[PDB]
Write a protein that holds these residues in place. Structure first.
Motif, mmCIF file in Angstrom:
data_model
loop_
_atom_site.group_PDB
_atom_site.id
_atom_site.type_symbol
_atom_site.label_atom_id
_atom_site.label_comp_id
_atom_site.label_asym_id
_atom_site.label_seq_id
_atom_site.Cartn_x
_atom_site.Cartn_y
_atom_site.Cartn_z
ATOM 1 N N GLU A 1 8.765 17.310 -1.012
ATOM 2 C CA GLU A 1 7.803 16.491 -1.741
ATOM 3 C C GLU A 1 8.346 16.094 -3.107
ATOM 4 O O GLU A 1 8.190 14.944 -3.536
ATOM 5 C CB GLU A 1 6.481 17.245 -1.888
ATOM 6 N N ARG A 2 8.989 17.031 -3.805
ATOM 7 C CA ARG A 2 9.535 16.723 -5.121
ATOM 8 C C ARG A 2 10.690 15.734 -5.021
ATOM 9 O O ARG A 2 10.849 14.869 -5.891
ATOM 10 C CB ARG A 2 9.976 18.009 -5.818
ATOM 11 N N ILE A 3 11.511 15.845 -3.974
ATOM 12 C CA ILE A 3 12.560 14.850 -3.763
ATOM 13 C C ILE A 3 11.942 13.485 -3.487
ATOM 14 O O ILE A 3 12.415 12.460 -3.992
ATOM 15 C CB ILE A 3 13.500 15.286 -2.624
ATOM 16 N N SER B 1 0.806 -1.212 0.000
ATOM 17 C CA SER B 1 0.000 0.000 0.000
ATOM 18 C C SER B 1 0.843 1.268 0.000
ATOM 19 O O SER B 1 0.283 2.364 0.108
ATOM 20 C CB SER B 1 -0.938 0.014 1.212
ATOM 21 N N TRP B 2 2.164 1.147 -0.106
ATOM 22 C CA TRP B 2 3.030 2.313 -0.198
ATOM 23 C C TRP B 2 2.946 2.902 -1.605
ATOM 24 O O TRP B 2 2.125 2.497 -2.433
ATOM 25 C CB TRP B 2 4.470 1.937 0.154
ATOM 26 N N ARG B 3 3.810 3.881 -1.876
ATOM 27 C CA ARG B 3 3.834 4.570 -3.157
ATOM 28 C C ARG B 3 5.204 4.582 -3.824
ATOM 29 O O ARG B 3 5.285 4.895 -5.016
ATOM 30 C CB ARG B 3 3.338 6.014 -2.978
ATOM 31 N N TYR B 4 6.269 4.233 -3.110
ATOM 32 C CA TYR B 4 7.625 4.304 -3.633
ATOM 33 C C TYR B 4 8.124 2.917 -4.022
ATOM 34 O O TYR B 4 7.745 1.909 -3.420
ATOM 35 C CB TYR B 4 8.566 4.918 -2.596
ATOM 36 N N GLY B 5 8.981 2.877 -5.040
ATOM 37 C CA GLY B 5 9.645 1.656 -5.441
ATOM 38 C C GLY B 5 8.873 0.860 -6.480
ATOM 39 O O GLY B 5 7.704 1.115 -6.779
ATOM 40 N N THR B 6 9.558 -0.139 -7.032
ATOM 41 C CA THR B 6 9.002 -0.977 -8.082
ATOM 42 C C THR B 6 7.941 -1.921 -7.518
ATOM 43 O O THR B 6 7.780 -2.074 -6.304
ATOM 44 C CB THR B 6 10.107 -1.784 -8.765
ATOM 45 N N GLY B 7 7.201 -2.557 -8.427
ATOM 46 C CA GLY B 7 6.206 -3.529 -8.004
ATOM 47 C C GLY B 7 6.829 -4.753 -7.363
ATOM 48 O O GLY B 7 6.371 -5.228 -6.321
ATOM 49 N N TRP B 8 7.891 -5.280 -7.977
ATOM 50 C CA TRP B 8 8.526 -6.476 -7.437
ATOM 51 C C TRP B 8 9.167 -6.190 -6.083
ATOM 52 O O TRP B 8 9.081 -7.010 -5.163
ATOM 53 C CB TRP B 8 9.539 -7.024 -8.449
ATOM 54 N N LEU B 9 9.777 -5.012 -5.925
ATOM 55 C CA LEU B 9 10.355 -4.651 -4.633
ATOM 56 C C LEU B 9 9.274 -4.483 -3.570
ATOM 57 O O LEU B 9 9.448 -4.923 -2.428
ATOM 58 C CB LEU B 9 11.192 -3.376 -4.772
ATOM 59 N N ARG B 10 8.160 -3.836 -3.916
ATOM 60 C CA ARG B 10 7.091 -3.653 -2.938
ATOM 61 C C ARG B 10 6.484 -4.989 -2.530
ATOM 62 O O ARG B 10 6.203 -5.215 -1.346
ATOM 63 C CB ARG B 10 6.020 -2.721 -3.501
ATOM 64 N N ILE C 1 12.791 16.845 12.019
ATOM 65 C CA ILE C 1 11.690 16.324 11.215
ATOM 66 C C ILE C 1 10.611 17.385 11.037
ATOM 67 O O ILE C 1 9.851 17.351 10.063
ATOM 68 C CB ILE C 1 11.124 15.039 11.843
ATOM 69 N N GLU C 2 10.517 18.335 11.971
ATOM 70 C CA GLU C 2 9.536 19.408 11.863
ATOM 71 C C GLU C 2 9.958 20.491 10.878
ATOM 72 O O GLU C 2 9.100 21.223 10.380
ATOM 73 C CB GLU C 2 9.294 20.035 13.237
ATOM 74 N N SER C 3 11.251 20.611 10.589
ATOM 75 C CA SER C 3 11.733 21.624 9.659
ATOM 76 C C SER C 3 11.580 21.203 8.205
ATOM 77 O O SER C 3 11.950 21.971 7.311
ATOM 78 C CB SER C 3 13.197 21.953 9.955
ATOM 79 N N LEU C 4 11.054 20.008 7.951
ATOM 80 C CA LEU C 4 10.639 19.576 6.617
ATOM 81 C C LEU C 4 9.234 18.996 6.731
ATOM 82 O O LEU C 4 9.015 17.801 6.501
ATOM 83 C CB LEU C 4 11.623 18.563 6.026
ATOM 84 N N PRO C 5 8.246 19.831 7.085
ATOM 85 C CA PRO C 5 6.906 19.307 7.383
ATOM 86 C C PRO C 5 6.044 19.111 6.147
ATOM 87 O O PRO C 5 4.830 18.917 6.258
ATOM 88 C CB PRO C 5 6.316 20.383 8.302
ATOM 89 N N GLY C 6 6.658 19.152 4.968
ATOM 90 C CA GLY C 6 5.920 19.024 3.727
ATOM 91 C C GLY C 6 6.243 20.121 2.734
ATOM 92 O O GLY C 6 5.425 20.448 1.869
ATOM 93 N N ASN C 7 7.437 20.695 2.848
ATOM 94 C CA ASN C 7 7.871 21.704 1.894
ATOM 95 C C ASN C 7 7.927 21.113 0.490
ATOM 96 O O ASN C 7 8.260 19.941 0.297
ATOM 97 C CB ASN C 7 9.239 22.261 2.292
ATOM 98 N N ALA D 1 14.386 29.377 -2.559
ATOM 99 C CA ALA D 1 15.377 30.031 -1.716
ATOM 100 C C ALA D 1 15.082 29.851 -0.234
ATOM 101 O O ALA D 1 15.987 30.019 0.591
ATOM 102 C CB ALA D 1 15.452 31.519 -2.053
ATOM 103 N N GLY D 2 13.843 29.521 0.122
ATOM 104 C CA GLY D 2 13.492 29.268 1.506
ATOM 105 C C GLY D 2 13.427 27.788 1.815
ATOM 106 O O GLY D 2 13.760 27.360 2.923
ATOM 107 N N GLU D 3 13.000 26.991 0.834
ATOM 108 C CA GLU D 3 12.962 25.545 1.031
ATOM 109 C C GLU D 3 14.365 24.983 1.234
ATOM 110 O O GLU D 3 14.578 24.110 2.085
ATOM 111 C CB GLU D 3 12.282 24.869 -0.159
ATOM 112 N N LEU D 4 15.336 25.475 0.461
ATOM 113 C CA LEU D 4 16.711 25.020 0.622
ATOM 114 C C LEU D 4 17.241 25.362 2.008
ATOM 115 O O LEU D 4 17.893 24.533 2.656
ATOM 116 C CB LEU D 4 17.589 25.643 -0.466
ATOM 117 N N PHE D 5 16.965 26.577 2.484
ATOM 118 C CA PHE D 5 17.414 26.968 3.817
ATOM 119 C C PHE D 5 16.754 26.113 4.891
ATOM 120 O O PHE D 5 17.405 25.705 5.862
ATOM 121 C CB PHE D 5 17.116 28.447 4.053
ATOM 122 N N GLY D 6 15.457 25.840 4.740
ATOM 123 C CA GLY D 6 14.781 24.982 5.697
ATOM 124 C C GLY D 6 15.383 23.591 5.749
ATOM 125 O O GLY D 6 15.583 23.031 6.829
ATOM 126 N N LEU D 7 15.686 23.017 4.584
ATOM 127 C CA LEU D 7 16.308 21.696 4.564
ATOM 128 C C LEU D 7 17.701 21.729 5.181
ATOM 129 O O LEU D 7 18.101 20.787 5.876
ATOM 130 C CB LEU D 7 16.369 21.160 3.136
#
Lengths: 502, 494
Positions: B489-491, A219-228, B479-485, B151-157
């Motif tokens: 999310e893109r990483i 039920s996760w979202r990351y990784g391949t199907g075979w790995l999951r 963990i609170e300093s990356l609460p969903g920036n 410029a703020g997301e990088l500083f937060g991370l």
């Protein structure tokens, strides 16, 4: 209830596919290994945990070697000459509890002592085999339909509580000096004992939490199907290996026995004749109770493995399976090892993994591997015991999800203004079709029964009687409950089929 | 970039909501304590850890008393005359690093030495104040607008990584020997060192996991709403206290120092004049470095507490905030304490806590009005207008923006359905038509600063807190300093 009728019927039913079963298993090729290894890992680790429990509870008389050998032998025999190959055999917690009671009784008696414990156990197994033969002959398996949901769920919660208690006991004992180890070793100094206990807490909780998280990888979202899929299937052995490797990290800076690791080392007919006759007679009691436990669990496990939703094209062999279990109990008693019985949820997991490709090959191979684990005892002795306590807690927690008794307890402990949250998500039908007060009365009665049985388990001699209380739930549900409840309420609360609503 | 233009605009903008700021803060009663206590712990724990680090690395000249006093005084002054009360002021890790470098430099100079470290630090602070004044007067904060979200997301991370590294370093140090304590002690034996390390691991991870789990108490099926709100509000402080209590359980079977535990101001003007004039001029270099660092940190922390998603109704005061930071840096240098500046994640956490406070107040008010209306007429459209009227009455009248207002009733909601209570659950539906709004005021900041100040007098109580709790909280804040920036999310999606 004509004598022998069920046995002949099951034998004739299963005798028309033997060659077909073996050939279908062979035709599966190397693709049959994944279900086999999956079930092997599902079965071996709990068996090793039970072996360690016995070793700590039998003063080393029975260890993981005995449980592994019993599991392997019984499983392979059930594969070769069994009636329901999908059923998984092994040493279960109730057997461990009965053996603990028997040892605690035997030790206190100078007549038997620790030297005749295995002989007495073998006599008990002989009696149990006799009673199982009688039960199979007298067609008692024809009334397995009366093992309603109430009894199964109550027994499941009782076993979960026993697992949790065992895990807590193991963690508490990790802080102390083992009974049969030298007390002058450096590792048993108060400082090293405290350090070992803290490390055990760390390792056990890490194993438990990581396994619980990994159970839901598909039920996760990351990784391949075979790995999951691999994570969702093998998160248990993977985490066991990972936390063993973690336990080896500070090895160079600490004494040899930090953390503690498996204490398990690397025919008894002659002593049987030396048991006093009076105790040979007295073996009737634990033998009868064990027969009750097996008559319950084997039937329930076969039923679970033979759910109609699987659309299995082959018949059931309850009577023949019970007869074969009696023979296996006799042989395990003679060989001086605890007997094995059908196990849960190993059988339903095997059935789902085979989804159906029914054959006698997967079970035979998995049992062969569980036996071969004995030849790798030096490898198994690298596992810390804290990991095994974490596994006990993991099994305890994982017994709950599909249990309606646990859900009704949770509803009891939910605030009145909050049942909409319960309704918002998936739930059972009795939540909507039954008034809450009736549910509360039912849950209070079931909880009182469960706590009574758990308290009885603590009694040293009379505590071996809990199978009788479990069996009494059949006549009680049959006669007493209808007096205090009304028809559809009981039918929905005690449905044989798991009903869920959106 | 005209002289004084930005400061004048900021002051004009803020001076028309000052009384509104105080009256809004006082409008809520003791319900303001939950954000206040959350932010007070979030600001006190890092400051105590930084104080211990400075005491170890500064030969006892600067301790946790100095950092606590600096945080308290700067926070109170900012809360009263700040310009952006959502900003939280405190002694940050970069300031600790720079002060450690300055002490290491001064200790090698016989001309300065150890006794003249604080005077040279004060001169560095004077130079930094002058540089900040120049930057604020010339409107150098206008470049802050140019910097985008990244410029703020990088500083937060980066700050998240710093906090996590600090936590891991503390956990590792729990296993080793301190370089200042008596080496020949029972609690410092190899076996007892290993025991202390493992106990610290247990305590820190327990605090972290229980805090992370209790953060989500509001979305639970069990307990009463009052209890769930209490947990969701005071879980992390409660877990700090609980695990401090747990650390005392084995006290009867262990040496004294297992586990390891934790433990005003003055003026340096007189000894300031004793510094020879080759280092008063020489202070310009670290002064310039600290000025640039503060210029970046203050602004990024301020703008991370003012995200557009929060729908703030009041203007920003970047220029005036930088001017006040210069004044506060001058004062802190004269007082012989490290300076304070805008710190993350404390400021975004403050804004989030205030948003949650406003959301819960709104939910309670609208639920009460809906329950009152359901009894009388309950026409499902005469009730919604009543809820909108209640919302509008609750809001505070200002001059810049207008309340968001309850959003449109969804088509699915109406299509599913006087009003039948069986087919209209207030709890399920109310959450779907509530905007995001922040309860902006100056009271929470003042109370948090005053509590940090009282921590100085409450040292004997603070002596009972193990350091493993500090490391667990450092991990929690990381963990609170990356609460969903969006960057995180893109990483994750990669």
């Amino acid at each position: 209830f004509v004598p022998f009728e069920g046995i002949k019927n099951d034998l004739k039913g299963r005798l028309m596919c033997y060659k077909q079963d073996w050939t279908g298993g062979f035709k599966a090729g190397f693709r049959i290994l994944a279900p086999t290894t999956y079930i092997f890992f599902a079965s071996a680790i709990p068996v090793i945990s039970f072996g360690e429990q016995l070793e700590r509870s039998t003063d080393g008389v029975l260890t993981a070697v005995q449980t592994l050998a019993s599991t392997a032998i019984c499983g392979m025999i059930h594969s070769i000459i069994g009636g329901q190959p999908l059923l998984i055999l092994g040493v279960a917690e109730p057997t461990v509890i009965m053996y603990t009671f028997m040892f605690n009784f035997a030790k206190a008696r100078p007549e038997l002592g620790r030297d005749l414990f295995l002989a007495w156990s073998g006599w008990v197994c002989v009696w149990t085999a006799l009673m199982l033969f009688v039960l199979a002959i007298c067609g008692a398996c024809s009334i397995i339909n009366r093992f309603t949901r109430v009894a199964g769920e109550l027994f499941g919660l009782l076993i979960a509580m026993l697992f949790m208690q065992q895990a807590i006991k193991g963690l508490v004992d990790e802080f102390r000096i083992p009974e049969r180890e030298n007390q002058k070793l450096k590792e048993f100094l108060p400082s090293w004992r405290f350090a070992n206990g803290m490390f055990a807490l760390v390792l056990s909780f890490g194993l438990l939490l990581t396994g619980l998280r990994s159970r839901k990888a598909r039920s996760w979202r990351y990784g391949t199907g075979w790995l999951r899929s691999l994570i969702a299937d093998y998160g248990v052995p993977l985490m066991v290996l990972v936390w063993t490797g973690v336990s080896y990290i500070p090895a160079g800076d600490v004494p040899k026995g930090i953390p503690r690791r498996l204490f398990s080392p690397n025919t008894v007919v002659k002593e049987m004749l030396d048991v006093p006759i009076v105790y040979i007679i007295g073996a009737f009691i634990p033998a009868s109770m064990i027969a009750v436990l097996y008559y319950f669990d084997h039937s329930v496990a076969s039923q679970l493995a033979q759910q109609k939703e699987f659309n299995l094209r082959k018949p059931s062999s309850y009577h023949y399976d019970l007869l074969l279990l009696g023979f296996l109990t006799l042989m395990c008693g003679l060989l001086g090892v605890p007997p094995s019985n059908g196990v849960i949820p190993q059988s339903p997991m095997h059935t789902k993994s085979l989804a159906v490709k029914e054959q006698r090959v997967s079970n035979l191979l998995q049992s062969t591997m569980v036996g071969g684990c004995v030849a790798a005892m030096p490898i198994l002795k690298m596992i810390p015991t804290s990991v095994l306590w974490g596994y006990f807690a993991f099994m305890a927690i994982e017994s709950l999800p599909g249990n309606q008794f646990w859900e009704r307890i949770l509803l009891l402990f939910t605030a009145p203004s909050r049942r909409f949250k319960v309704l918002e998500d998936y739930h059972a039908t009795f939540v909507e079709t039954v008034p809450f007060k009736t549910i509360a009365m039912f849950t209070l009665f079931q909880t009182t029964y469960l706590l009574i049985c758990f308290g009885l388990t603590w009694i040293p001699i009379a505590g071996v009687m809990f199978p009788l209380m479990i069996m009494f739930l059949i006549p009680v549900r049959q006669y007493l409950l209808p007096r205090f409840f009304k028809g559809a309420h009981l039918q929905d609360l005690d449905a044989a089929e798991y009903e869920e609503a959106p």
